[PDB]
Design a protein around this ligand. Structure first.
Ligand SMILES: [Zn+2]
Length: 75
RNA sequence: AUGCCUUAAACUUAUGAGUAAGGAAAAUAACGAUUCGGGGUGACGCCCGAAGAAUUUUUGAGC
């Protein structure tokens, strides 16, 4: 398996996929807007009640939503 | 972070069937009908019912 690679570890590949999705989506979120918690979750720092969201995919989908946009323009 | 060849590949980016139970967002429905009685609740929530002409000035007691 050294000379030509054999097989693939689909669980670790899925871990890598989660990292690459995270890096991609994170580069479009400015550093003030998102606060990363101790366990790897994310809070929205715009919205006054700080909702906490499990992934960066959910944080991006939240930042699309109308509650966030209304809370955004006040800040 | 170097140019070219058939975007170099006429290669693939897979992840079964169910049981029971939670968390978070998106989306979406409403705002003031006042008091009284009853249901409910630790308490509110909530729910069910009922209802500008009259003594100090400008619409005259004046003739
Ligand atoms: Zn937000």
């Amino acid at each position: 398996m050294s000379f030509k690679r054999e097989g693939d570890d689909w669980s670790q590949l899925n871990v890598l996929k989660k990292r690459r999705v995270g890096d991609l989506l994170a580069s479009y979120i400015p550093e003030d807007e998102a606060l990363m918690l101790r366990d790897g979750r994310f809070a929205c720092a715009i919205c006054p009640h700080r909702p906490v969201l499990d992934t960066l995919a959910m944080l991006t989908a939240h930042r699309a939503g109308k509650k966030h946009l209304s809370s955004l323009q006040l800040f």
